[PDB]
Amino acid sequence: MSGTLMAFDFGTKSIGVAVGQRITGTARPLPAIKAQDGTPDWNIIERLLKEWQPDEIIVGLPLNMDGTEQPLTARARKFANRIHGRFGVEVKLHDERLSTVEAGGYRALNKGKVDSASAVIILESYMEQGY
């Protein structure tokens, strides 16, 4: 086990991506992957997996604030299943409940990585909770 982990935050127009290392206990965003009604260019994922060789992949399971499922939940499950079927890598789901984001010299990451922020949160959550 290399300790390398990868997480995806499923979306219909964009799928966030983060990579983590158990060895250092950290995670960071990679550029998000554009999607066409949830379908990515699978060669991007193939490349990411071959280069990072993650021990396992984590996909967020989207849920409402109260924990109930939403329309997107089923599609995220299909996505997680398709990564496992196409690449053989172990895929784990991790709950991702919606929450309120609370309400000049400013600096922000480039858009591609900003679009992967939820994937970094998923992966930090997964590691912090001890999975």
Curated annotation (Swiss-Prot):
Keyword line: Cytoplasm, Hydrolase, Nuclease, Ribosome biogenesis
Result for mutant: residue 115 to A: Does not process pre-16S rRNA in 70S ribosomes, binds quite strongly to pre-16S rRNA-containing ribosomes
Predominant localisation class: cytoplasm
Coiled coil: none
Effect of residue 103 to I: Allows cell growth, i.e. not toxic
Gene null: resulting phenotype: Essential, it cannot be disrupted.
Assigned GO CC terms: cytoplasm
Subunit structure: Monomer.
Descriptive protein name: Putative pre-16S rRNA nuclease
